[PDB]
């Protein structure tokens, strides 16, 4: 059998007995086939419904206990066996089971002792009986439990980012049944940026929270902090959802969605105007965003007809998410809490945004059609259909009850997107996976991202360029190195995937992959470096591993600076040079301009020797295990050499001018009739004029000063004339067109 065989039988008996009572009385016999088809979140709900009508059947109750046993939910499984046992006493093997499980989970309660006594008298002196007798003794004493607790605390002092240890603390709290302390630590730990990114931790967070909601302690204490803990559950679900989608398979991700949707339906009823309500708002958006990503995962593997229909469905999901407003940040108690929520807000808008675009780039106003056709409530049932099995009650499912009102159906603005990205860099602990995706998403767009601003948000007060550039010691790392690094990681990643899709043939849709579904986009080498330099900078390394981490970074530095044995293809170097020139040429301050321009000259000075050999159609010495994979896809050709020599010579003059060699700079600038040379020629003529323009000074000199301002005016005019005429030149502008016009207005009024 398969999934089709079992979900098609739904329509077989649905057409034979349609009343609700007989539909649920078939739940046990429905669940009979899902246990065989490996569906355990589904089989659970089928049998549980038959139990809602046949609550006195010992067979059905035991089957759920055996299913909760496969789920390893001891507290839930035990209770199920109990019901089957109290209905039918002849089930001896279940009296053993109850005794077996009670002694394995926790011995503190005498209930484990009681059921063991009964288990003994049903099986006199059997081999398992002693086994349980030794197990019950195994558990440690009060001094022993406190002893274990002290180890974890002393261990957590120096290792607060260890996933396993923090998990054990929650398990120890849960073992002493002081769940309030378990969630308390669970709540204070969702502020940890590292733990929030851990799949296993968030899963534990979901259980320890749920356990507390149903726990007797949650009700008795008070109903005031009840809302607070409820928020964390939603937060955990969002984080857990993001991670499960990437690593786990299609089946597990869908199952988590149902837990997410159940929680949302249970929360919306309270409402209010506090952190929980604001949290519900942001988490609501995440749900659709992840739901859209989940949809696209299924379609990727599937045929073309489902792909378009699913992507259409996903496009609506991301849209819903993007529409959701920025959560009310002020309304939260603390700075950490509010900053986190906003961080996630930026993440939602950024990821959904780029997805919305790449899906809208497929066709003309593709977004408009999606809304006009599926914004209809008919889509709400078509969405619920594709994602879930229709058998689940469509009433308590948040998805089926949401009010889809006035979908904006407005494509996102790039400027807004940039600020969304920059604000969400710290969303996923700056994993190179995170950044390599964004960098690639902007690779198809006409505006480029502020990487240098990304790096400033991660490594604060890291200098743009280090004074001691002579050595490769990794204490001299600079934001330029990282910017230079990320450029290659993305330039490398794009080419590798380009080669991959060529091999995949089938249907070509390279832009469409979402962030969770795709696998590692960088080489494990590259990822190891980024993870190292990150842990080092943020001061979350290990004294022992310091020297190793430190050396691992040092290994690649000589390559990021195009030094001895750099594994750099000439094309990648060129890409770095111009990408830094244009990045720097648009900057306002002199410190940063000089730095970015310097490195650009550096890489230029390293390429030109290579270009000369390539200019005569010779061979480049290929690398030895290069850091950035070489590709013949982008191997440099002779057709473009003379331009680069020209484009490079400008860079020389620009630096000569900045250094003071105006005579040589001007002599060079005038030599080449380039749009960029105008903005440079003009900018330096303007400065020679402005300073000398108004002081009392020799009249003859004043006329010569004015003469330069006259030259400034002309060159700005040459820029705009050639700009309005041709679009290709507009893109060559070192600064925005309006900035050139802005100066001109002031230049002429002078």
């Amino acid at each position: 059998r398969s999934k089709a065989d079992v979900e098609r039988y739904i329509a077989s008996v649905q057409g034979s007995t349609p009343s609700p009572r007989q539909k649920s009385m078939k739940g046990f016999y429905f669940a009979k086939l899902y246990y065989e088809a490996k569906e355990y979140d589904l089989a659970k709900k089928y049998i549980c419904t038959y139990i809602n009508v046949q609550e006195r059947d010992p067979k059905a109750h035991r089957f759920l206990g055996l299913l909760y046993e496969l789920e390893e939910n001891t507290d839930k499984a035990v209770e199920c066996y109990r019901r089957s046992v109290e209905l039918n006493p002849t089930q001896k093997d279940l009296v053993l089971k109850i005794a077996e499980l009670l002694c394995k989970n926790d011995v503190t309660d005498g209930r484990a002792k009681y059921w063991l006594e009964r288990a003994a008298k049903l099986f006199p002196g059997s081999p398992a009986i002693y086994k349980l007798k030794e197990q019950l003794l195994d558990c440690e004493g009060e001094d022993g439990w406190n002893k274990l607790f002290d180890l974890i605390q002393s261990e957590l002092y120096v290792r607060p980012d260890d996933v396993h240890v923090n998990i054990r603390l929650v398990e120890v709290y849960r073992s002493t049944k002081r769940l309030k302390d378990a969630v308390a630590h669970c709540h204070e730990a969702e502020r940890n940026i590292a733990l929030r990114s851990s799949l296993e931790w968030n899963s534990c967070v979901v259980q320890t929270l749920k356990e507390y909601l149903e726990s007797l302690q949650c009700l008795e204490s008070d109903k005031s902090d009840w809302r607070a803990t409820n928020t964390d559950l939603l937060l955990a679900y969002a984080n857990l959802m993001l991670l499960t989608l990437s690593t786990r398979d299609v089946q597990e991700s869908r199952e988590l969605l149902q837990s997410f949707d159940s929680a949302l339906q249970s929360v919306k009823s309270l409402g209010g105007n506090d952190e929980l309500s604001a949290t519900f708002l942001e988490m609501k958006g995440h749900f659709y965003m992840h739901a859209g990503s989940l949809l696209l995962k299924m379609g990727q593997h599937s045929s073309n007809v489902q792909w378009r229909a699913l992507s259409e469905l996903a496009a609506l999901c991301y849209l819903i998410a993007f529409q959701v407003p920025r959560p009310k940040i002020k309304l939260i108690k603390g700075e950490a809490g509010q900053n986190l929520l906003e961080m996630m807000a930026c993440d939602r808008l950024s990821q959904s945004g780029h997805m919305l675009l790449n899906l809208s780039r497929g066709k003309q106003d593709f977004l408009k059609e999606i809304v006009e056709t599926f914004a209809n409530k008919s889509g709400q049932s078509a969405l619920y259909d594709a994602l879930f099995s229709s058998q689940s009650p469509k009433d308590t499912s948040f998805l089926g009850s949401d009010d889809i009102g006035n979908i904006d159906v407005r494509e996102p603005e790039l400027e807004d997107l940039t600020r969304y990205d920059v604000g969400a860099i710290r969303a996923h602990n700056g994993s190179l996976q995170h950044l390599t995706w964004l960098g690639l998403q902007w690779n198809s767009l006409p505006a480029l991202p502020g990487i240098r601003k990304w790096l400033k948000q991660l490594f604060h007060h890291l200098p743009h360029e280090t004074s001691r550039l002579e050595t490769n010691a990794p204490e001299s790392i600079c934001i330029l190195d990282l910017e230079v690094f990320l450029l290659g990681v993305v330039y490398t990643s794009h080419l590798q995937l380009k080669e991959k899709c060529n091999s995949h043939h089938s249907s070509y849709q390279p832009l469409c992959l979402p962030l969770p579904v795709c696998k590692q986009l960088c080489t494990e080498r590259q990822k190891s470096w980024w993870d190292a330099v990150c842990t080092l900078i943020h001061r979350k390394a290990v004294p022992g591993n310091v020297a190793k981490l430190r050396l691992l970074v040092q290994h690649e530095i000589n390559t990021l600076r195009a030094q001895e044995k750099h594994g750099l293809q000439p094309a990648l170097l060129v890409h770095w040079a111009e990408c830094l020139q244009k990045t720097g040429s648009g900057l306002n301050s002199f410190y940063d301009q000089r730095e970015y321009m310097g490195r650009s000259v550096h890489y230029w000075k390293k390429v030109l020797p290579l270009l000369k050999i390539i200019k005569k159609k010779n061979s480049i010495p290929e690398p030895i295990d290069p850091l950035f994979k070489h590709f013949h896809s982008v191997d440099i050709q002779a057709s473009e050499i003379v331009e680069y020599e020209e484009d490079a010579h400008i860079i020389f003059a620009i630096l000569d001018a900045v250094n003071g060699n105006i005579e040589d700079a001007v002599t060079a600038f005038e030599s080449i009739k380039s749009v960029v040379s105008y903005w440079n020629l003009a900018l330096i003529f303007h400065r020679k004029a402005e300073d000398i323009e108004n002081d009392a000074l020799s009249p003859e000199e004043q006329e010569e000063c004015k003469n330069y301002l006259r030259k400034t005016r002309d060159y700005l005019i040459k820029i705009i004339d050639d700009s309005d005429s041709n679009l290709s030149v507009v893109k060559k502008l070192p600064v925005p067109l309006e900035s050139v016009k802005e100066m001109l207005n002031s230049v002429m009024q002078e």
Partner: antibody
Amino acid sequence: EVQLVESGGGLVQPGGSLRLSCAASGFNFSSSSIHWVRQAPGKGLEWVASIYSYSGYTSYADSVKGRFTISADTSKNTAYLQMNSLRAEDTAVYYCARSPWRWSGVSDGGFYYKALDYWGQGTLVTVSS
Amino acid sequence: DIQMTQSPSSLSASVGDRVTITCRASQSVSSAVAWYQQKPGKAPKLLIYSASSLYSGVPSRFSGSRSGTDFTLTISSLQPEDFATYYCQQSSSSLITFGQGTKVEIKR
């Protein structure tokens, strides 16, 4: 261009709490180990806390162990000395200083620092009810 | 616990003298000792690191030396600007300790 600035001092009552701020600039804060060294009036230098260069494992003198807490923030490029259960005995001039990774060596049984190159001006802390 | 015993506590000398201060480590300690100059009220400044290596910028008349567990600071020709208090410092495993200090008073 390179300096250390101490702040967050002032007077406090015994059994109270304070928080000192050692602001650094000009050298990469990640690769530097941070220390605090107090000096009562007319007395000598007393080491009270340390933070290993690249990770930040703490180490305190037994005279203040468990009461003080020293921390380092990469985003703010600043170190702090959190002080609790302050006693009249803690009245002293508190200095901070760095020791590069070049001078920070890790060995079996604990770590050692070759010397303290950069020192701060020193912020005064008075503890008296 | 390791202890750095500094001697003398208070010294009196005049200009040009060849002055010597010594610190003894109770336990056998490796060459991870330092020396500092602290003028009244000001901050302490680093003179010698790693026992006998001179900190860049410190005058050449300062020199450190070791013999067994006794470390010694040596000034070849005393100058007027060196009349201040000095301290010796050891860095053992996850612990730092300073000497009691040595005041260099002008003799008259």
